[PDB]
Amino acid sequence: AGFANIQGRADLSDVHLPDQVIKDVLQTAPEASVLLNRARKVRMSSKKTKQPVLA
Amino acid sequence: AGFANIQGRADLSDVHLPDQVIKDVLQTAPEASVLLNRARKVRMSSKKTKQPVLA
């Protein structure tokens, strides 16, 4: 044919028409723990610790 | 005693008469793969690769 030949998106390869990528993941920041910040913090050096109490 | 005495090989130790060893293996020189020599080679960088072709 002579006329009305036109280049469509359907005529090209996936290598001609690639999607753009964003490397940054869409997420919210990780939440910090309640007790690991509110509670008083002590360094243990055995499986158990003991304290005397007035009773 | 007498005149018949001569040293045989059966009279010497395995350390006196050691066998020589040859460290090269007797082997048929390895033919290469057909496809890895004959076919066109490219580096892939993911589980799938795609290319354009004329239609």
Question: Mind explaining what this structure looks like?
Answer:
This is part of a larger assembly, with two copies of chain A (55 residues). With 55 residues, chain A is low in regular secondary structure. Helices cover 7% and strands 0% of the residues of chain A. Chain A has one helix at residues 35-38. The longest helix of chain A has 4 residues, at 35-38. Chain A is rod-shaped. The termini of chain A are far apart. Chains A and B meet through loops of A and loops of B.
Using brief descriptors, characterize the structure shown.
part of a larger assembly; 2 chains; little secondary structure; virus; 1 helix; Bacteriophage; about 0% strand; about 5% helix; about 55 residues
Q: Strand count, sense and closure of the main sheet of chain A? A: none
Oligomer: part of a larger assembly
Quick one: how many beta strands of chain A?
0
Total number of helical segments of chain A? 1
Show the largest interface: A-B, 4 and 4 residues
* Cα distance spanning the termini of chain A: 104 Å
Structural class assignment of chain A: little secondary structure
How large is the share of residues in beta strands of chain A? under 5%
- Helix/strand order of chain A, N-terminal first: H
Outline of chain A: rod-shaped
Helix percentage of chain A:
under 10%
Cα Rg of chain A: 33 Å
Protein name (chains A, B): Capsid protein
Subcellular location (chains A, B): Virion
Organism (chains A, B): Mycobacterium phage Muddy
PDB class: virus
